[model samples]
Target chain A: MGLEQLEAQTNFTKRELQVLYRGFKNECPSGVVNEDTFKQIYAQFFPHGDASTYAHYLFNAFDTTQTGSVKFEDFVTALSILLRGTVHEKLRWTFNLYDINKDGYINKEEMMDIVKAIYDMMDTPRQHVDVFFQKMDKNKDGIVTLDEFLESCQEDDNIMRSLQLFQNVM
Target chain B: AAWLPFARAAAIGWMPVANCPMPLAPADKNKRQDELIVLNVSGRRFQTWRTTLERYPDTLLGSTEKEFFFNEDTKEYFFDRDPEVFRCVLNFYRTGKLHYPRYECISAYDDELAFYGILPEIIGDCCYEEYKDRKR
Candidate 1:
């Protein structure tokens, strides 16, 4: 379908549209788009959403904490949902690599370094990446502590809601 | 054939090489011609002249006698006269993977992270509540 058709049929903003386009370009692996596969992938994170309503559901999921701003954690979680494995599995792998001291928790320094590395790896905008890092570093300590990281992971309702919306519109 | 039989016996742990003269040191002198000594597998003598030259260039000119001893506690072979450059050898006689971190993070993926007694369902529920409201 044409971009016009997609725009007309959905409430996705221009920026969100751009993100979707880029996401489709960069993220969509080799696979045919079909009802069953879409439903399966969507169900892993947004179990309640049907094909027509999953997009908005995803958008809300990206919002993360319902703080009226999409932060880095939300952004990463959304990306993880789009990824192949479970969110828990991804987080575990991330922790193993970043926790240099082998400590049970990741301090602010570790988190910031890792977030910066991830942003660079993803080729996201530098400004957007900085903004996300700032937002997640709630204490203004210039780093994200384990508590902060856990809090962000726990904040998934907005993401779930947005995914539900996408399912409805799908 | 004799060497083969001895090598086989040594491999099977039936014979010990402890008292056997090291291949590199034959004379067993406390100071061997003012040089350190090393051994090879075939029981050949070799003066560590290069090591002595590198470590003690001045001592090489004097030909002073030296003594050396291996420390069992530290597992180091050191010169008794200088007591420097002690070679410590670590022996890991066991086999298995080792995990260093005593604890795990709060993330759900670490099996050890759950040792903190935090419930995954609780974390999941908290996540669900935190994102409960938005455009969707």
Candidate 2:
């Protein structure tokens, strides 16, 4: 999308969009980047970083088209979500990342994989996951639906900050 | 003197104002600056005003006559910039006033001024005298 249209649909103003566009062009000169390549691009900035794992999940979440690659529109759209979207919007976007299989609901195994990737070597214990699932699985179903997650976060707004979207953007 | 319009300044819409860290003592009616601009620059927090005819205005985010971020939590005009360099810029915005150290690393001041769209000019003779005498 051109800068004008992107600005209208997104919270980013023209200047921020310009800078974001500049970064996107520099990173993906060919106009798109696949997940594996995206992982490497973020990792190169911090080789010893667990951030690579974080970016791995983030890349999956933002690849909304499920095309395995992110075009320019996808990049800025995701950027706006993380940077300016409401808490509900961000948490839902995050759910897709944790969902792994993209089945529209986050299941036990899928959550566990995201936990492992984000916390590296599965340093996170099952109790933490269990407690989260217990709270998030409001329907008593085996998976966490977007509604359950959003509802839970809204009920206790702290959950939004607790989930910690874009913690590393600084 | 009767109340009259001052063309030297923007036709400022004076709002009722207070509480910031730079000394909250009441100001001489003649010496007051504009609103509190709360900033979180590189995690350092404080705030600043109309001297804000900045080059960037926090990168095109604010309206004319002011740059405002209005951090909802802090309830003030919020944005981020290198607070260290901003002292000099702030001094300039106080309209040809001065605040050195501004940062002791003075070399970077010019680059920062350029970024803020401030033109280079020395502090005026009157301001220098005020600085020395005021410090006494």
Candidate 3:
């Protein structure tokens, strides 16, 4: 795809896209990155603990084609949102990432798995996911839809604060 | 009163080209090496010597290609870019070193460096780790 189209779709300017493409091309000369290389690159950023599982999940999110590899377009598009999209847009991506089965809803099992992977990568103590579900799974539905997730995150001060911490772009 | 229009011009990224009351070009041909240049970035102005930029002719500002941004009417180059990041870019030209601006996000800093034709690999080792840490 041309940089013009990508620029229209993402938050990146044409010059920024060129730069990102150069860096991406350098690391992934084949024009795309497979899961293994992606995992290696991701693990390098987190040296304190294991990042394999989390990388696996993140790779799946980026590999929208389900072709076992992520193309430059996919990489930059997702990055545009993560790094520059609005809060609502970012929350939408977070919801999608949390919905492991692609079933359009996030359940306790899915949340627990992602949480455990995050804790493992951070080398932090394992924490229970029950409170999260208790707060998010409104109406005793046992699953959190995007609406519930967004509502809970917005309503709860601590959840909003946690989101800010993750958003430490500075 | 003479400097007032120059300041206003710098604020709007334009000025009267003829007989503008601002820094004058050196009169002596031998002093061509000391020529001063004006740059307007997103309405902010910066000035420096040509030799300072000549240190890295490979860069956009260092090369003759920089004239692409020049405004003949204002006798100043204008760029619709972030001035905050330009501080680092201009500094790199002066000091031969690049350091991450801790206040900027990775994507922003990267975009500025790329736009300026500055390589990210040139970032000093002291800030590289922390710069990369923003990814996590």
Candidate 4:
């Protein structure tokens, strides 16, 4: 989508846009516009925008190793780029704290709890989260893995774009 | 007062801070004796002063001693430019205290501290023993 179309779909501020633009500029110094980078830059500034629906796209971008799971180091790097301050801080806390099962990887249940905590902290209505959970549970297996979560962050453009269309419809 | 004006003029001229290491010490033999380990963190190199802890007695009680700088071009972490500040950080590493002027930039300091395995809560505690365990 064009920048205008993308902007209409997302609710990012000018400063956030500046940060995203800078990040994109740094990533693609040659000025080649990679769609995935555009979407990620958009999402980093607007985390609440159709994040659940865009899971697959986000996953594929960093799963360059194609191992179905992202390495912990890569996860930290991506999270560092996407999140900032307390939201990022709390996620890091949850990532370390809830890995109590100590498998070195966070599975779907842990992801759900962390998401639920974040949702609660944001004071979002509980009813809204049911749909979000369903959208994120891509395998229909009731648990969202780290890979699934990353993908959602990456692929949220369609949902965000559709939401904009709906807003116009309304 | 005469020396003060000269110092002020030097500062106004963008001279480096006094007490910062010289380009070359007059006492070359003594300089070699005072040599500290210089580490390349992400990209910047920091020289650890041998007597950094003794010189800055305050930084000896905390985990917040190590200071870092950003290598903008390479996007890597490196040592601070000032030798005394690097020594202060190194002193904090050797002795668990921070005696020098507190480095006020929390985020920058914390990021580098995290790299060195010293979190904020553990300040003033023994960090050198813990450093080996902190490496990723």
lDDT of candidate 3 over A1-170, digit per residue (tens)? 68889999988778677766765775567757876775555454446767678667666666657676878777777766654676566667777777777888977778777766655554223444566677667787788888877777677664344333322110
Better of 1 and 2 by lDDT: 2
Name model 1 segments beyond 4 Å from true. A1-90, A98-129, A156-170, B1-136
Q: For model 4, state the Cα shift of residue A159 in Å.
A: 9.2
Residue-level lDDT of model 4, residues A15-58, one tens digit each, is: 34334433433443323334444455556656666343233334
Give the per-residue lDDT of model 2 (tens digit) for A30-112: 75776555565545443564545545665665555766687878776765665567776666566656676778887777766
The regions of model 4 sitting more than 4 angstroms off are: A1-112, A119-124, A127-129, A158-170, B1-136
What's the lDDT for candidate 3?
0.66
lDDT of 2 by residue, B1-136 (tens): 0001000000111000111221112234432233445656567765654324342354232334234455566665444567787666565554435454522444565566555555545555644554344334
lDDT of 1 by residue, A1-170 (tens): 23334444445533344344334322222122233443455555554444433332333223325554443333433443334334454455444455545565555555455455434322554345366556555676555556665456557566434433432111
Chain A TM-score by candidate, in order = 0.29, 0.77, 0.81, 0.29
Fraction of the true interface contacts (Cα pairs closer than 8 Å across chains) found in each model: 0.00, 0.00, 0.00, 0.00
> Candidate 1 — what's its lDDT?
0.36
Residue B88, candidate 2: Cα error in Å is 32
The lDDT values for all models are 0.36, 0.52, 0.66, 0.43
| Each candidate's DockQ | 0.00, 0.02, 0.02, 0.02
**How displaced is residue A39 in candidate 1, in Å?**
33
Q: Across residues B68-107, which tens digit of lDDT does each residue of candidate 4 receive?
A: 1223354333442334344445656666573233433444
Best by TM-score: 3
Q: What RMSD does each model have against the real structure?
A: 28.4, 18.0, 19.2, 18.4
Query: Quick one: ranking by TM-score, best first?
Result: 3, 2, 4, 1
Candidate 1 chain B — worst ten consecutive residues by lDDT sum?
A: B84-93
